[PDB]
Design a protein around this ligand. Structure first.
Ligand SMILES: Nc1nc2c(c(=O)[nH]1)N[C@H]1C(S)=C(S)[C@@H](COP(=O)(O)OP(=O)(O)OC[C@H]3O[C@@H](n4cnc5c(=O)[nH]c(N)nc54)[C@H](O)[C@@H]3O)O[C@H]1N2
Ligand SMILES: Nc1nc2c(c(=O)[nH]1)N[C@H]1C(S)=C(S)[C@@H](COP(=O)(O)OP(=O)(O)OC[C@H]3O[C@@H](n4cnc5c(=O)[nH]c(N)nc54)[C@H](O)[C@@H]3O)O[C@H]1N2
Ligand code: SF4
Ligand SMILES: O=N[O-]
Ligand SMILES: [C-]#N
Ligand SMILES: [Mo]
Length: 720
């Protein structure tokens, strides 16, 4: 039994449940939920079974080197490993310039790790080649939040769940992907049974079993569906002119200033009867969803990958925001437009930290000369050290690696050989014979390690301390609960030594530990609308998270952004009750985005949509959840969901083996037969390394956010 409990954060989803880690004699023995965090001491099965993951001996515990391409990976000392890393990166720069090198990181890295790596690269080497897996995930929501509101991140919090009276859940399997939050959604409807839930997703998932209405629309057509909802809202006079006349601007299909009549005129193109056939849904679903949405006392929307992983990803985020803005279902408890973040730290580490190729910390942008100067000053750099061109975004990064333009890359706390789209193309790029790939990776069964030239053994999870920022602007600390095993070291320390040895100015990496970097990050946020200077380590050790803006030590944090009296970034003396201060006139923007479809729609040759999805027992590539026997009990291996009425028509029975084929590859998979998938749709999970499904998927990206369309491509099925 535990002699002490160590406060931290669940290693997995963007719900960011707080955890207490029971330790006895330097060994973790137990785990419970933080009663004092938003989750109220509740964890899902994954969270509960983190202790066997932390205790696993199946770890990378010494540095490894692959002397030659194709060779065995063999033990090498830390000092040799760091010199090789430093010397290779420094030579690449020396010879070919800063853009020859890259960082490919993670929403699972601590905020401090991503902060150091971002600084080393952008301020140290002089390259903006810094990107990470939230590009694969949250970049569409950043675009939607920035274009609609002028600033990133939700404006409500999880607490709004407890007061909503309608939930519109689109592109989200909340029960399998954010279990604690789904339980909270179900709980609210349990307590207030008048509560209405619309679940919009081409698949019928466990999330829909609390839904008043499940809209099983055809993949790609939710933009039309959502415009059609605004038509209805407008048509039946369910909109909120006192709101939008004061607080909202309208932009036409060309992106030019327009107005409410322009909005109305545009929406004539999305009448319910016409859009109902596009979407393959009964028309009464458009009227029902719209009315529930608008008539409800308070409406909260929630979405994830089905919206974001799309070539029209940004546009889809805007269309959700349009509904909240036309109705004024925003800036009020219960009423908010809440994008769900998938990773434990995409928000804290990557989005807020500006650890993407076009960004700078705390709201700043690379193309922006003032922001560059603001950072050169804060970081003590010579003028112009920060390059004015964005670096390579993830897809183009790995394309650049394939061409030989990026010669040295660091991969940290991600598994891109398993999780990048269009894998045959990526595996080739990653096999460039003159590339130097360094992997910071905790588990030896990560398929990406088959591409690494050097592997560095990290402290995992609560083997070290640092901050995770979840989907609700909550910054929570994990304190160190146990020692790392073998030769495992905190990546914050590894990065500093790397930098130092590679000729970076030591004033740039002046950090003994992760606390040191936090204090600087605190400083770099100060005065911005991301200001969290009031989150001292002391505060974060005692509290179970603070929600930013939190500009000072006597400030409790912020639940309602953009709201006079609740958001410290809204001047107390501001004339209006709301203030969208990310736009220069204080107004949010309704965008009249034309509705299109997938980059690769089905046709005669490939008559099926193919989608890819989460499953509850498995975390992404299964290098962690795979260490837990109980998590292997329901879904041990990959499958392909097939619709019943589709199956029968083509002579496919259940458990039967099928070849899923697309323009790029062909994979045998046992068929799972249900009404889960709507007619003309199949779905594959991605946790199985023996079934690298991203070999089938296309690579196309939102032209703005550069997120890949993993959620749609054209496939075909054939009895093995
Ligand atoms: N158990 C578990 N939980 C997790 C994770 C995990 O690996 N395992 N990972 C986390 C991460 S990083 C993320 S990003 C999230 C992902 O969480 P979600 O995005 O909620 O989960 P997904 O299954 O990826 O996709 C949700 C739905 O998108 C739907 N979809 C497909 N096409 C379309 C479309 O055209 N329109 C719409 N509106 N929907 C569509 C699919 O039917 C699917 O049911 O979950 C997080 N939580
Ligand atoms: N087809 C398809 N593909 C997808 C998606 C999809 O919906 N469909 N979803 C996309 C999305 S949203 C995301 S978020 C990505 C996620 O894709 P990845 O980030 O590739 O998936 P993970 O399995 O989370 O990889 C994290 C790695 O970190 C390692 N690790 C764990 N702890 C530590 C540590 O302390 N230090 C270090 N250095 N390493 C550690 C783990 O062993 C693991 O190998 O997948 C994307 N890929
Ligand atoms: S819902 Fe997410 S944060 Fe909460 S315990 Fe489950 S996996 Fe962890
Ligand atoms: O939960 N991985 O499909
Ligand atoms: C982030 N997922
Ligand atoms: Mo994600």
């Amino acid at each position: 039994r535990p002699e002490k409990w160590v406060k931290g954060v669940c290693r997995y989803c963007g719900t960011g449940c707080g955890v207490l880690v029971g330790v006895k004699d330097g060994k973790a023995v137990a785990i419970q939920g933080n009663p004092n965090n938003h989750n109220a001491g509740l964890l899902c099965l994954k969270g509960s079974l983190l202790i066997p993951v932390l205790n696993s001996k199946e770890r990378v515990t010494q540095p490894l080197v692959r002397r030659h391409k194709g060779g065995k990976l063999e033990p090498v000392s830390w000092d040799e490993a760091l010199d090789l890393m430093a010397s290779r990166f420094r030579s690449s720069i020396d010879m070919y310039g800063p853009n020859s090198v890259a960082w490919y990181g993670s929403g699972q890295c601590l905020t401090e790790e991503s902060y150091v790596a971002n600084k080393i690269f952008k301020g140290g080497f002089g390259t903006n080649n810094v990107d990470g897996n939230p590009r694969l995930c949250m970049a569409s929501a950043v675009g939607g939040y920035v274009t609609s509101f002028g600033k990133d991140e939700p404006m409500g919090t999880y607490a709004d769940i407890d007061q909503a009276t309608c939930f519109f859940i689109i592109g989200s399997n909340t029960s399998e992907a954010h279990p604690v939050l789904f339980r909270r959604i179900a709980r609210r409807k349990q307590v207030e049974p008048g509560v209405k839930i619309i679940v919009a997703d081409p698949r019928r998932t466990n999330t829909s079993r609390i839904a008043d209405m499940h809209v099983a629309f055809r993949p790609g057509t939710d933009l039309a569906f959502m415009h059609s909802m605004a038509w209805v809202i407008i048509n039946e006079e369910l909109d909120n002119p006192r709101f939008w006349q004061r607080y909202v601007n309208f932009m036409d299909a060309e992106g030019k200033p327009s107005d409410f009549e322009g909005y109305k005129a545009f929406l004539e193109n999305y009448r319910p009867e016409k859009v109902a056939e596009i979407c393959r849904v009964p028309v009464e679903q458009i009227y029902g969803a719209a009315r529930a949405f608008a008539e409800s006392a308070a409406t909260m929307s929630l979405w994830c990958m089905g919206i974001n992983q799309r070539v029209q990803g940004v546009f889809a985020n805007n269309l959700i925001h349009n509904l909240h803005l036309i109705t004024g279902q925003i800036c009020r408890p219960g009423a908010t437009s809440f994008s769900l973040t998938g990773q434990p730290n995409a928000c804290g580490g990557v989005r807020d930290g500006g650890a993407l190729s076009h960004l700078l910390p705390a709201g700043r942008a690379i193309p922006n000369a003032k922001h560059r100067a603001e950072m050169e000053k804060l970081w003590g750099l010579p003028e112009g050290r920060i390059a004015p061109e964005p670096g390579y975004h993830t897809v183009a990064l790995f394309e650049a690696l394939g061409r030989g333009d990026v010669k040295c890359m660091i991969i940290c706390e991600t598994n891109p050989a398993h999780t990048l789209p269009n894998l045959n193309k990526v595996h080739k790029a990653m096999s460039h014979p003159e590339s130097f790939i360094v992997c910071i990776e905790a588990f030896p069964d990560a398929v990406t390690l088959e591409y690494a030239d050097l592997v560095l053994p990290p402290a995992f999870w609560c083997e070290r301390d640092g901050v995770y920022g979840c989907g609700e602007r909550r910054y929570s600390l994990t304190e160190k609960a146990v020692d790392p095993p073998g030769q495992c070291r905190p990546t914050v320390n590894t990065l500093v030594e790397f930098a130092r040895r590679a000729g970076v100015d030591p004033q740039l990496v002046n950090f003994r530990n992760a606390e040191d970097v936090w204090n600087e990050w605190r400083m770099v946020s100060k005065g911005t609308t991301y200001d969290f200077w009031g989150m001292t380590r002391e505060r974060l050790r005692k509290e179970s998270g603070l929600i930013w803006p939190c500009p000072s030590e006597d400030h409790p944090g912020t639940s309602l952004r953009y709201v006079r009296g609740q958001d410290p970034c809204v001047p107390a003396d501001h004339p209006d009750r709301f203030f969208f201060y990310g736009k220069p006139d204080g107004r949010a923007v309704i965008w009249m985005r034309p509705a299109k479809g997938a980059a690769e729609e089905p046709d005669a040759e490939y008559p099926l949509y193919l989608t890819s999805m989460r499953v509850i027992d498995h975390w992404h590539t299964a290098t962690m959840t795979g260490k837990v026997p109980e998590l292997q009990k329901a879904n041990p291996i990959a499958f392909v969901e097939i619709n019943e009425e589709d199956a029968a028509r083509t002579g496919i029975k259940h458990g039967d083996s099928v070849i899923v084929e697309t323009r790029r590859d062909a994979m045998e998979l046992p068929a799972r037969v249900s009404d889960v998938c709507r007619p003309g749709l199949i779905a594959v999970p991605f946790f199985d390394p023996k079934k690298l499904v991203n070999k089938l998927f296309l690579d196309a990206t939102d032209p703005v956010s550069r997120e890949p369309e993993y959620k749609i491509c054209a496939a075909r099925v054939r009895k093995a």
